[PDB]
């Protein structure tokens, strides 16, 4: 139904262009320049007609951006350049051979009920030349994709090695985290670690740092910060207009409280919380059982740090488990209070919760796939019946409401998955987001692709009135995919550049919360690159574009548009907003390699599930080779490069430390490290 | 056909008992005591009515045997104790529930042609109670096997840790082998390694040793040794009887040579070969291009050695590849002349050769499975037709000729697989034999189990005249398995204890080759434990016993007999012969864990392939769980214990080195190590 595609594309191009215009209007205004130019303030480079920025973004080269935002963001954006590198030959050759097989003569808005139309290129049985060409194309597609990811993986590896070589000092290039300290009745954990490492690591141990469990104190200090926010807001309200409210601590859910002045209320409760903070501080600093069986341990050289990170320590591999340590900003200090014993319990519980969610969630996807000619209830006929209601507005609905509905029902999902990986326990934001991304990708591949296509094949003609079924169900699913890629591709990228919610929160806090200056830096909140959201969306688009690559080229151009548009929009954003919260130098890239490989193999399997419907069609002896070839090449690249992403060589550590000690022969490493990792709460 | 089993078992018990008798006769004779008591001569514990040894062997405890032969042999024998630990409950419960389902009422010599007999427990369709009991039994079988291998794997791990802790000094507890030295135009390989390690490993590098390529010199020195053997034999012939032969260097393939005296011949050719050895020695010691890009590198502590072994060195993981080093006796000095570039070429070529062999080899297995009522050609009727020829001798043939034929056609196969893994290139006898064992197990599982069962299902009634097929073909295959387990179980173990070929070679060399004393140690050749042969046979028996465990318990007792018999025979042998050629402290045990797991999962899959023939029989929701549970538990144990077998912890190295330096504060490590690893040819 090409007209549905047309009207949806038109309305979305319009909405995107409107969004770009409003962005120009709000950006050119300097009185809110802070939010649209968060960076250059955090970097300290500034203080205090519309498409003009599109050429502006594509000016700053790669190395300067790397120095600017960090290699993380650069590679995360390079993902899009990758995908375009895969797909542009995909688009050209798919549209160049698949369609001229003989829009000229393809599906052209057809349905399976055409049991009498009997159009030319319609079904399986023999189609020798057609099927062989399809196979040859699938083969060459996979060949090209393999070449591309091999080259890209090599480049990312070289980039990461060069970066960490030239990277300056960080207090986590020595420190290593050791898990599972076996308890002893007499010796405290700290001195256990001291003895172990003094005797086990000679000439290289420098100092350790016991991990505490102040999660209760962290909770109460967050409570204090919240209460101070409330005090400041209410005080600004009183200053602006002299009046005291009787809200019982909530206003909305506030009971029949008096709060005649409410200033004495807040000052007294703030004092109470502060003094209880004092008692909590003293008791946590005076409690051995608060000590946890882990402690950050700092070395004297990168060499020793790497060596102790990459090798086991004690006979029992569940005992004294050692691993690289993140930045003091990076480590999630609320998950070092979970003993390693209950980790697997938590992990399996979260697997259970994830399965229940990915199963409860087919109900919304089916409710979305109800996008068919079925309309509202009969009792509201005057409500849902108008002059025509079935001419063009129906194309608008079929091309618009599905996309917006699905994108609305994938709204809280990253929040839920972040909660899942958080209470799972990982202690490092980098790994938290990588895990949540993996989970969200699994969620997408299960629910919002396979569940949708199966449900669609189910609704019309009722599973064909009780392989050959999907062999006529795939195309209209390509249609729904075009609709959704529109809505949560181009319009979504527009919303990304607009930055609405941070803007409005910024203005609200300036109006009500901010009382003076120097809180602007506190007030301004550049967010983050949001890897957990950006990564799975693009991986889904890889999945969908490859699986439809030889079946229907009509999908590809929309993919290519989205890739270029997001590339440019995110380059601008990274340059000007979205500071890197942590710094994991190209950590996740093997995840990309794997997930793209997985989408590739799924593509080949589904192409099998279509083509092989004719038994003994002489197709299986080729189509089964491709999944194996993909997996074999994936192991080739895994073992050929992934080292640089998974584990740090030693000659590099030696070279880096030689150069550092040449430049700075008078660095007090011990003083620099001892106060690191103490705790955010502990000053 | 129970009578075939009976006659085969009877003749094999007789032949085994005869073999034990001849063994007693030859052992009690002291004039050949050397060969049947090879050890206690190599260990230097001795110089210069029949079942009496069976209690004698089961006296010496485990630790003393470990100190005697080595932990390798102890665990290799403990394999059998393992298997009995699995199977005894398997036998008891299989025979206790499977048969009393209701020999009393089971297959009892039936064929699929009984389309009118229509016996009770015969086919699939519903058999609710029977099939559910079969399922429950498969479940409990797998549970028990999992418990057993978990406990056994734990014990082997504890044993290996304790052993290497108490193990005394060996010149390969420091040395590490480094592969792929990147060539440089000016610097030689040795000094490249010197610079790299002095700068990269400080305070711990001790010395290296360049790997040479004297494989040509090794070949010519083996030629010299062979020629000296020929000289000694011919000289003893002349001394015994004064006569000179005219054999032209081969005798059999000897041409019309003169050899009027042939003593001047051999002395002159020996001199020529010796002087050419001299020139070869000088040119190899004076040739840079003979140097290979690898060199044995020795450290000062176990700590440093382990650290440099378990961590990558240079950016390129194909460059300077480092790995643990074996003993000077252990390393296969003929495969250090193969550059790492051509290794993968060789590996793939050997995969090709292995596939062609495992495919050409179905022809002999089918020729064996021709064991049916088909007899010799018609033209030889007086030759193959006798008074009866079809009463009892046919049972003898059907229970005897298959076993002997198959065991004869698996004769050269370990030799071929050793050649395969040798010219593949591995440099370490330990890994050579482990790889050859893996290959031989693959060969068995492909050809001599699956090919045999499929061919058998194919011959009778011609694939049932063009699942349900094997569902009546499995039993007679259990019959053929009983026959073969007989022949190459019990009789094979008898032959193992008899030690015929080393005996006869020993007597021949004493008679003809030996000229004096002090060559007895040279003359005596205890062979080796022959892991490459013993391991796959027992793994095959695991495969077969587990796959038939709930289908036909009648197989199990023969397995149990073989296990106990080989346990005792090999305990005796290990005690008294079969010195350990190398010493890999429980290296291969994870291979055992994996291969038994593989047999277990294959068992569960075949039980599926039988039981599920009734579609929707409510069996699949359980039978698919078992393979996954097995694989999951296998990863549980892998990650929970395999460390101790795959990679050496560090606290252990530190403790060992502390204790050594406490005991021997005056050990010249450098002098002790520098001359190690030089080459066997180089003194």
From Swiss-Prot, chains A, B:
Regulation acting on activity, per entry: Activated by hyperosmotic shock after mannitol or NaCl treatment. Activated by mechanical pressure: activated in response to membrane stretch and poke. Membrane lipids play a key role in mechanosensation by acting as a wall mainly formed by lipid head groups.
Entries under InterPro entries matching the protein: Csc1-like (IPR045122), CSC1/OSCA1-like_7TM (IPR003864), CSC1/OSCA1-like_cyt (IPR027815), Csc1/OSCA1-like_N (IPR032880)
A single Gene Ontology CC term: plasma membrane
Membrane-spanning segments: 3-25, 79-102, 129-150, 347-373, 392-417, 435-457, 470-498, 532-553, 555-570, 591-613, 617-635
Membrane topology listed for this record: Multi-pass membrane protein
Main function: Acts as an osmosensitive calcium-permeable cation channel. Specifically conducts cations including Ca(2+), K(+) and Na(+) in vitro. Inactivation or closure of the channel is calcium-dependent. Mechanosensitive ion channel that converts mechanical stimuli into a flow of ions: activated in response to membrane stretch and poke.
Protein name per its UniProtKB record: Hyperosmolality-gated Ca2+ permeable channel 1.2
Any Pfam family hit: RSN1_TM
Assembly: Homodimer.
Regions of this protein lying in the Cytoplasmic compartment: 26-78, 151-346, 418-434, 499-531, 571-590
Annotated source species: Arabidopsis thaliana (Mouse-ear cress)
Alphabetized GO MF terms: calcium-activated cation channel activity; identical protein binding; mechanosensitive monoatomic ion channel activity
Effect of residue 307 to W: Abolished homodimerization, leading to formation of a monomer
UniProt-annotated location(s): Membrane
Keywords tagged on the record: Calcium, Ion channel, Ion transport, Membrane, Transmembrane, Transmembrane helix, Transport
Impact noted for substituting residue 501 to I: Abolished activation in response to poke
Predominant subcellular localization, coarse grouping: membrane
Family recorded in the similarity comment: Belongs to the CSC1 (TC 1.A.17) family.
Effect of residue 410 to K: Converts the channel into a constitutively active phospholipid scramblase
Ranges of the Extracellular topological domain: 103-128, 374-391, 458-469, 554, 614-616
A single BP term in Gene Ontology: monoatomic cation transport
């Amino acid at each position: 139904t090409l007209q549905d595609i047309g009207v949806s594309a038109g309305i979305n191009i319009l909405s995107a262009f409107v969004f770009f215009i409003i962005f120009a209007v709000l950006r050119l205004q300097p009185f809110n320049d802070r939010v649209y130019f968060s960076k250059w303030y955090l970097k300290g480079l500034r203080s205090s007609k519309f498409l003009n920025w599109m050429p502006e973004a594509l000016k700053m080269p790669e190395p300067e951006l790397i120095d600017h935002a960090g290699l993380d963001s650069v590679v995360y954006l390079r993902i899009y350049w990758l995908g375009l590198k895969i797909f542009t030959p995909i688009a050209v050759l798919a549209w160049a051979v698949l369609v001229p097989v003989n829009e000229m003569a393809k599906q052209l808005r057809n349905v399976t009920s055409s049991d009498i139309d009997k159009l030319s290129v319609s079904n399986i049985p023999e189609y020798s030349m057609r099927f062989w060409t399809h196979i040859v194309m699938a083969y060459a597609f996979t060949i090209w994709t393999c070449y591309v990811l091999m080259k890209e993986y090599e480049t990312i590896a070289n980039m990461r090695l060069q970066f960490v070589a030239s990277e300056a000092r960080r207090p986590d290039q020595f420190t290593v985290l050791v898990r599972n300290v076996p308890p002893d009745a007499d010796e405290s954990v700290s001195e256990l670690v001291e003895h172990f490492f003094l005797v086990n690591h000679p000439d290289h141990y420098l100092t350790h740092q016991v991990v505490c469990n102040a999660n209760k104190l962290a909770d109460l200090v967050k409570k204090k910060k919240k209460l101070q926010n409330w005090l400041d807001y209410y005080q600004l309200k009183y200053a602006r207009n002299n009046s005291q409210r009787i809200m019982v601590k909530l206003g909305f859910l506030g009971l029949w409280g008096q709060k005649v002045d409410a200033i004495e209320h807040y000052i007294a409760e703030i004092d109470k919380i502060s003094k209880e903070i004092s008692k909590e501080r003293e008791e946590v600093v005076n409690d051995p059982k608060a000590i946890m069986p882990a402690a950050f341990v700092s070395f004297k050289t990168r060499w020793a740090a790497a060596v102790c990170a990459q090798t086991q320590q004690t006979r029992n591999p569940t005992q004294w488990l050692t691993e690289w340590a993140p930045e003091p900003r990076d480590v999630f200090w609320s998950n070092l209070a979970i003993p390693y014993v209950s980790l697997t319990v938590r992990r399996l519980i979260m697997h259970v919760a994830f399965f229940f969610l990915t199963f409860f969630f087919i109900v919304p996807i089916a409710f979305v796939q109800s996008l068919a000619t079925i309309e509202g209830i009969v009792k509201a006929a005057p409500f849902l019946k108008f002059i025509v209601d079935d001419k063009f507005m129906k194309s608008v609905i079929q091309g618009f409401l599905p996309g917006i509905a699905l994108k609305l029902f994938l709204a809280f999902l990253p929040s839920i998955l972040m909660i899942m990986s958080k209470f799972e326990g990982f202690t490092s934001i980098s790994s938290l987001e990588r895990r949540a991304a993996f989970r969200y990708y699994i969620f997408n591949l299960v629910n919002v692709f396979l569940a949708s296509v199966i449900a669609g094949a189910a609704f019309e003609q009722l599973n064909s009135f009780l392989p050959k079924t999907i062999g006529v169900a795939i195309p209209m699913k390509a249609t729904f995919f075009i609709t959704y890629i529109m809505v949560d591709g181009w319009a979504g990228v527009a919303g990304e550049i607009l930055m609405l919610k941070p803007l409005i929160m910024f203005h609200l806090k300036n109006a009500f919360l901010v009382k003076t200056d120097k809180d602007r830096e506190e007030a301004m909140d550049p967010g983050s690159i949001g890897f957990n959201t950006g990564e799975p969306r693009i991986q889904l688009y890889f999945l969908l574009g490859l699986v439809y690559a030889p079946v229907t080229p009509m999908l590809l151009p929309f993919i290519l548009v989205f890739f270029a548009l997001a590339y440019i929009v995110y380059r601008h954003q990274i340059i000007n907003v979205y500071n890197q919260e942590y710094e994991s130098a190209a950590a996740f890239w093997p995840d990309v390699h794997g997930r793209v490989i997985a989408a590739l193999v799924i593509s080949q399997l589904l192409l099998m599930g279509l083509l092989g419907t004719k038994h003994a069609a002489l197709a299986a002896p080729f189509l089964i080779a491709l999944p194996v070839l993909t997996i074999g090449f994936h192991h080739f690249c895994k073992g050929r490069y992934e080292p640089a992403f998974i584990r740090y060589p030693l000659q590099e550590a030696m070279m880096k430390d030689t150069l550092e000690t040449a430049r700075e022969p008078n660095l007090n490493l011990k003083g620099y490290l001892q106060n690191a990792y103490v705790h955010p709460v502990f000053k």
